[PDB]
Amino acid sequence: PRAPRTYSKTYSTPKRPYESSRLDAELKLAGEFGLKNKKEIYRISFQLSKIRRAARDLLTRDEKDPKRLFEGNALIRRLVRVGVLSEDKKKLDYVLALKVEDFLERRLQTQVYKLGLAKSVHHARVLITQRHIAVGKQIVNIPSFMVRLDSEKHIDFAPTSPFGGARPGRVARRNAARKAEASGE
Amino acid sequence: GISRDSRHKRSATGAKRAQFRKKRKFELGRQPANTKIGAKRIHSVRTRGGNKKYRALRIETGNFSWASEGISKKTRIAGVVYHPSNNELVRTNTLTKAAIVQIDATPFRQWFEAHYGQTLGKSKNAERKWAARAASAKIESSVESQFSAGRLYACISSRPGQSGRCDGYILEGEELAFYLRRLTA
Amino acid sequence: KLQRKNKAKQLRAQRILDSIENRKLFEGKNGAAKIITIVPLVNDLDPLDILYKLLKCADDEGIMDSKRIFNVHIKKFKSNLKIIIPDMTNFLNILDCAKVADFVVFGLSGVQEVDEEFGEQIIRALELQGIASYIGVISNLSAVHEKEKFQLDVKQSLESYFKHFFPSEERVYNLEKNSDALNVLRTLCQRLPRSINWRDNRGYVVADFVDFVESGDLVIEGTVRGIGFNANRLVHIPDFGDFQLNKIEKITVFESNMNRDT
Amino acid sequence: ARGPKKHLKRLAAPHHWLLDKLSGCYAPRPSAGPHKLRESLPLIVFLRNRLKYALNGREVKAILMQRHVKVDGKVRTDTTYPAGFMDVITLDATNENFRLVYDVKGRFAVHRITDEEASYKLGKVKKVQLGKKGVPYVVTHDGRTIRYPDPNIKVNDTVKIDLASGKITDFIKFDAGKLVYVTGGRNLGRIGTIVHKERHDGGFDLVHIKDSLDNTFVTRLNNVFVIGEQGKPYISLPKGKGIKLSIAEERDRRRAQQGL
RNA sequence: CUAGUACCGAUUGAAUGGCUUAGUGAGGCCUCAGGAUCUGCUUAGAGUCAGAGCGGA
RNA sequence: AUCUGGUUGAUCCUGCCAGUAGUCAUAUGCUUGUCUCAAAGAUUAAGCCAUGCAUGUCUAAGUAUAAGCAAAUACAGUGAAACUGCGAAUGGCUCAUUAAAUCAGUUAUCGUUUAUUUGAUAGUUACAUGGUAUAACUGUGGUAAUUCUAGAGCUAAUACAUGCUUAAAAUCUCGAAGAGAUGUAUUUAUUAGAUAAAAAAUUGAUGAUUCAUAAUAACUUUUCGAAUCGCAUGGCCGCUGGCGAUGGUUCAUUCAAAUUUCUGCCCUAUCAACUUUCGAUGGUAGGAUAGUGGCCUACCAUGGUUUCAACGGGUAACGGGGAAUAAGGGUUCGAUUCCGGAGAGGGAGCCUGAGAAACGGCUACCACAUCCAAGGAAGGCAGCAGGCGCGCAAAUUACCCAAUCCUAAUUCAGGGAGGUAGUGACAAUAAAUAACGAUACAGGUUGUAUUGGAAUGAGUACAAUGUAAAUACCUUAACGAGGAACAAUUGGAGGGCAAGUCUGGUGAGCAGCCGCGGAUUCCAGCUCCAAUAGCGUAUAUUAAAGUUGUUGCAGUUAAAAAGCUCGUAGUUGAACUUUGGGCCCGGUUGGCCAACGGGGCCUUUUUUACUUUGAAAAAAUUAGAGUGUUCAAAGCAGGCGUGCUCGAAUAUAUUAGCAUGGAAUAAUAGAAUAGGACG
């Protein structure tokens, strides 16, 4: 038979369910950034967990070990590109100081709010899912899309929508027609 | 049929073994030839790879070497006289490798008396040859005394059941003394 | 290990012999017929459409009349079937017909949905007296064709409805498709029904013919299906009450020996 | 199994062919021929996957049956014919010639050669012996047998063969200071010069190699192929001269040039 | 009264499996024989007219 | 990584239990809108099977008078049947047996067979031989019946069987000259295949050979050494010639097979002695095999294994790459996508062939079981689809060779191998169920209620795209929301453990545990909490668990030091032998200098364990570098002008074997009747 397709699980569940102090901290993030699930938080903390595991491992290696040089530089370079880590803090020891809010701040859903365009993080989510936002030429409709530092110049309304320059939507057209027809009465 | 596998034997510790697999074809054996003196009868058998073996059943003449004289002659085989492996082979006149047999002497005498010009018991071209050879006309007394009866002792050196033919050499020296003791005992 | 294995093997031999002992009753033309009853839940359907579409897949037109009971042998499955059709005017006669069946075939319409005042009351009542087995069938789904996806939308609705009463079943066949109708026919021939506890502890038979003799001596012939009969017993007929049998014969004779109940 | 096997499941194929995982269940099994299975390259893989001249297995057969392709100067039509190291492939239309030789990653390169160089190939001497009637012969790695070799030629030497006629025109002795090509194992594809050899009676001899950046490595003698004198290869080398680079060096060059 | 749980232990009832005493033994294969038939040559039947005798399958 | 609750009226311990989280671990209950991706009759029964299909194949180039078709008087296009050749030993399925067996890594054949591919290689013995010959075909028939087949009349070969033709010389035997013999294969016996170095009375290879190869005398019942096919039509005055196809002897090569060295496996002593008649361990000779060997036979000897666990019993036991569980060490699992082994209801035997002890081949017995004219005939789904039975437990009697590849005399035919769609809450990725103003009221720009325009896909559908043809996705004209009924569930509210002094009833129900009730714990209604297209329960297993403890437990009084002493196997065992000091070179890193490493010179100058470096350890999986699949799980791609061009890295992988540097730690050996060293 054909070779197996590989797949993997992307989140982890907190090991004590009813730790009351934790429940409060999670709900503030969801209200601040307009998330729909706790899973959206678990996903981020799962990624952050693995980054620390790798970084902490490398720090056992001596400086000028060729592996620490090669892979350590890759990891730092890759986080700077998305803007999670400042290019001032461009050193491996600072990777251990990142926290969840550093990643949520970079989601397309929040960037479309900080730029204007929308007027709440709840309004921003609606526009993305309804296909009004484009990055460069490509229409994007996923809220969790991580905006790389180059792309921020190119976020704007899509060419093929109202707000972007196309024809009015289905409901505006219906209203104009009935009123025009009645105005002929 | 017959199988040459090791699987059926006990182990060297004495343990008994369970059956691993059915008998394979690549490990077979076959039944013996048991060739007898008679009149020529030979069959053939188709072996692995498409090769052939010849399986002699009855034989009467062979090729025998006069090794110290350096010549070979075809001659008739008279009978079996001694066998190292099993005395029953003597009773039945069965031929195998290393059987001791008597052979008709007359082809060797006719060669000898022409080659050396001397009885074993005419023209310038002949006399000149005999004169050159005459220095080598001496022969072992234990051999020469056999020619009065017309039969010599010989040993079979071919494998008749594998190759279909019976060949050997005349007993000649320390070997002759050894078998004469065994044979008169 | 050997005697472990041996025991398991000879235990399996009993199970397999036991399965044969059950099946021999239906084994062939020499065996007993299986009693099928058709019950359309909507008058739109006409029960003759149901039976006809089944008989086609038997692939012997010699099978295929002023009557409502039919005896059939199916060469394709070497099986004997008796079909009973009730008179859908007489609600009480429906229950009496379905009371004796091994298989009840429920006819559903794709065009008109069952009415609560009548159609459902059939289903509800049959469940509470008990049913030996049941099959859901559709015969007219192509009457709402536009694309067969529209047929599938309806069929899913009917299955969800049907499963409410019979959660053991998850399929309703479409007889307009040869594959389904053959599948239904195979099941009736091959599979065994459930028992009915209160019925099978009694004896019962269905009349092949009836005859009268002089106050009368009514003769019935048929097949035994319950626990059995004895000539000293008493016999109930649902519309008429209790009566005494005087003789039995096997198609040897048995007679009511008067050392009997009264 | 009761006899020889005709199929090769994908994933079991040699990794240096660079087949993808998902496009099918099977891989082309090489026919019996001049080169060992594990280290040959079937023609289908060359025409389809490397040169892109064909889109399908079917189109590859359409090319071969027109007799456009010849290997070592002879026309071949078997789709799974096993070409191998040092062979010359010629496409007459398009007017192109290629020699099969390894990249430093240990893959067969697409290496173009002139119409002049297509006349000859090199061969490693595998044995030398007397045949019937007492005629001596040599055997090369690609399985040719050549009558009447020069009495100086010995095992492990390398021999230059004219593809027309098929006769020896030159040879080089195995000795220190020769150039070598590594043709197996972890160091496959590197080039250097012989420093010295280790004798191990009843075992495997080892050879010490130095490259032009004076890195050193060791390989079994079986993996060594002589290709010329110091600084004078008898054949055109592939791009990059067989100099291995560390992963840090490669990253720097790409972003320097390709990344400007 | 009924339910549940077991022991012996009678029939071998009537079977299944391991070990074992005695006796027998299908089939193909190898080998000593047999020769329904078919056919070559030969003094010789006629210008196919027989017979004999020496071979092969 | 390092939790919480439960033993006095009141406490601290030991100890076990309950709770919690994961599972490429199965089942099951309630619920279910969108995109991508995808396991699936293993567990019980290696149980039984209706019907259909799964292996055949032709080019210019073996054999054509079809009374086939279609249009160069022997033939000439295309082409059914049939002979001939090749294939059917691969693939696909399953896991019953099997515990030094299979298997893994690492070796060997100087111990052997090999269709095919590739490369070499036969001056040595008629202008074309015969039926000891026949299929398809024509024609006469038998039987209830099958891929049953008889009698008669025709004719081919790359089938079968026979049999010729081509140089010169040299050497040896016999005998003045003459005459005779010699290729290759088979069987035997002899011969060569050299070698450290000097003076007198020609020669190959290996660590290693009875190697490769050659020579002499013979042997064989007599091996091979072209009675074959296509295309083209040249040269010289009836002679000579080209490019291919198919065969054939031996050697080498390739795809392979068989045997084989070293080390490694789960539980059990309520298994301590086991093997040898009837091969157990060894020697000599023979037989048999492709070949080594007690593989088998004759004769002879008395051996072989074991407390460092033999032999016996058990496994709900095919081995490995691997999977789950992340502080570290471990524990549990691996029928199942790749590699190796075994089997085709159970045992045994064998034909054909390069290759089989074959089961979509045959023969017999044992157990099942089909048709019948009752005489006979036929059988093997642990291939694909499907049925019965079993059970907690698993899909359609669908379409196609378009892709991946394989087989054949072959570009063309065939392939349930393989692909496509159907069924599918096994597991995995992304993500709808509403956003924003006005007005009224309250608050400092945020809450609570009447009211208004905008936005969109779920769904449906013209079209194009997709595809072998289709469905769906991606794109799109028209239609498609106000209780936006286009209406989100599953478990809880005393504690462990987030959240009710609410309210009505009652005096069977709840509860893993402690407990409630003759009511904050039941039942009903409000309200509230948690996870959410998902949530609950049962069983097994891992972590928390230091309740299996090497890291790392405990034994006065809580479970646990044997009445006491001796003693074999096993584990363990005191100190000591070249140390110090000078003088050069010297690389790396940081400020000529310092530190840290390394080499050389001088000064009286046997055998193992351990550790470093290197080669090896298949791919997939794991860790990990690059790359806007719209993001992601994935994939191995893809960039740039609008022909050019970078890639498909790297690491890890106990133990055993191989090569190499070191000399601390721990073992072993040496000169004492000197029988010692240097001489």
**What ranges do the domains of chain B cover?**
1-30, 31-105+151-185, 106-150
D117 by Cβ neighbours in 10 Å (0-12 / 13-18 / 19+) ranks as: middle
Residue A155 lies in a domain: yes
CB contact burial A11-33 (16+ within 10 A = b; e otherwise): eeeeeeeeeeeeeeebeebeeeb
Residue A12 lies in a domain: no
Subunit contact D11:A3, Cβ cutoff 8 A: yes
Neighboring chain A residues of D25 at a CB cutoff of 8 Å: 1-2
Angle at D70 between CA D67 and CA D76, to 5 degrees: 65
Tell me if A153 is assigned to some domain.
Answer: yes
Q: Which residues of A fall within a CB distance of 8 Å from D21?
A: 3
* D168 CA to centre of own chain: 19
Across the A:D interface, residue pairs with CB atoms under 8 Å apart total: 15
Cα distances from A117 to residues A114, A134, A144, D3, in angstroms, run 8, 12, 18, 73
| Tokens encoding A160 | 């093929």
Q: Are D21 and A69 in contact (CB < 8 Å)?
A: no
Strand E contact with C8 (CB < 7 A): no
Segments in C83-177 forming alpha helices (H): 91-99, 119-129, 148-165
| Angstrom resolution of this structure | 2.9
What are A155's two structure tokens? 């976020």
Question: In strand F, which positions have an atom below 7 A from any protein CB?
Answer: 20-24, 30, 37-39, 45, 88-93, 97-102, 113-121, 174-176, 184-190, 204-207, 212-214, 216-221, 250-260, 274-275, 279-281, 284-298, 304-305, 310-316, 326, 337-339, 341-343, 348-350, 352-359, 387-391, 396-397, 402-407, 411-412, 417-419, 427-437, 453-457, 460-461, 476, 479-481, 497-499, 529-533, 614-626, 628, 630-637, 645-650, 658-659
State the structure-solving technique: cryo-EM
The radius of gyration of chain D from alpha carbons, rounded to an integer in Å, stands at 20
Round to whole Å and give the CA distance between B170 and B109. Answer: 14
Place of tokens 């190759």: B163
Residues of B (14-43) placing their beta carbon closer than 7 angstroms to any atom of strand E are: 31, 41, 43
CA D50 to C1' F636, whole Å: 15
**How are beta strands C79-84 and C34-40 bridged, if at all?**
parallel
Backbone angles phi, psi at C192, to 5 degrees: -90, 145
Which alpha helices (H) appear in chain A, and where do they start and end? 20-33, 39-58, 66-82, 101-104, 108-114, 121-129, 170-183
Please name the residue of chain D whose CA is at the shortest distance from the CA of residue A68.
D248
d(CA A26, CA A22): 6
- Asked if residues D209 and D180 have their Cβ atoms less than 8 Å apart, the reply is yes
Span CA (D201) to C1' (F212), Å: 22
Q: What is the DSSP letter of D104?
A: T
Measured CA to CA, the distance from residue B38 to residue D49 in angstroms comes to 73
Sort out which chain A residues have CB atoms less than 8 A from D247's CB and list them.
70
User: Phi/psi of residue D183, each to 5°?
Assistant: -120, 20
Q: Report which of C62, C68, C32 is spatially closest to residue C48, judged by C-alpha positions.
A: C68
Chain A residues 105-144 with Cβ under 7 Å of strand F are 119-120, 122-123, 125-126, 129-132, 135, 138-144
With contact defined as beta carbons under 8 Å apart, do A131 and A139 qualify? Answer: yes
B171: Cα within 13 Å, side-chain hemisphere: 22
Distance D83 CA to F572 C1' (A): 66
Please give the radius of gyration of chain B, using alpha carbons only, rounded to the nearest integer: 23
Residues from chain A contacting residue D250 (CB–CB below 8 Å): none
Q: Which positions in strand E are less than 7 Å from the protein's CB atoms?
A: 16-18, 28-32
Q: Which residue has the tokens 């859901």?
A: C136
Cβ neighbours of D254 in A, within 8 Å: none
State whether residue D23 sits within 8 Å of chain A by CB: no
Distance from CA of A86 to the nearest CA of D (A): 22
Chain D window 24-63: which residues touch A at a Cβ cutoff of 8 Å? 24-25
Q: Give the CA dihedral C24, C26, C29, C31, nearest 10 degrees.
A: 60
Closest nucleotide to B32, Cα to C1'? F287
Let me know if residue A9 belongs to a domain: no
Would you call D247 and A70 a contact, using CB atoms and an 8 Å cutoff? Answer: yes
Instruction: Tell me how far apart the alpha carbons of residues C110 and C49 are, in angstroms, rounded to a whole number.
Output: 14
Q: F230 C1' – C210 CA distance, angstroms?
A: 91
Nucleotide lying nearest to A24, CA to C1' measure = F498
Cα A177 from Cα B13, distance rounded (Å): 103
Point out the residue among A3, A5, A70 whose CB comes nearest to the CB of D248.
Answer: A70
Chains B and C touch (3+ CB pairs under 8 A): no
**A173 is in which domain, residue-wise?**
17-185
Residues in chain D within 8 Å Cβ distance of A77: none
Nearest protein residue to the C1' atom of F614, measured from CA: D218
Q: Which structure tokens are listed for B166?
A: 């019976």
CA of C56, C1' of F386: distance in angstroms: 21
Q: How far apart are CA C90 and CA C239, in angstroms?
A: 14
D133 touching A (Cβ < 8 Å): no
Residues of D in contact with A70 (CB under 8 A): 247-248, 251
CA distance D45 to C109: 61
Q: What domain count does chain A have?
A: 1
Q: Which of D210, D106, D123, D110 is nearest to D170 (CA)?
A: D123
Residue A65 CA: distances (Å) to CA of A62, A68, A70, A71, D213: 6, 5, 9, 10, 22
Cβ–Cβ under 8 Å, residues B15 and B29: no
Strand partners, B100: B82, B155
Scanning the structure block, which residue is given the tokens 């704007």? A156
- With contact defined as 3+ CB pairs under 8 Å, the chains touching D are A
d(CA C20, CA C18): 5
- Euclidean distance between the first and the last CA atom of chain B, given in angstroms as a whole number: 42
Question: CA of D202: how far to CAs of A159, D198, D199, D205, in Å?
Answer: 78, 12, 9, 9
C14 touches strand E (CB under 7 A): no
- In angstroms, how far is F9 C1' from A92 CA? 62
Distance CA D71, CA D77 (A): 10
Q: Is D105 helix (H, G, I), strand (E, B) or coil?
A: coil
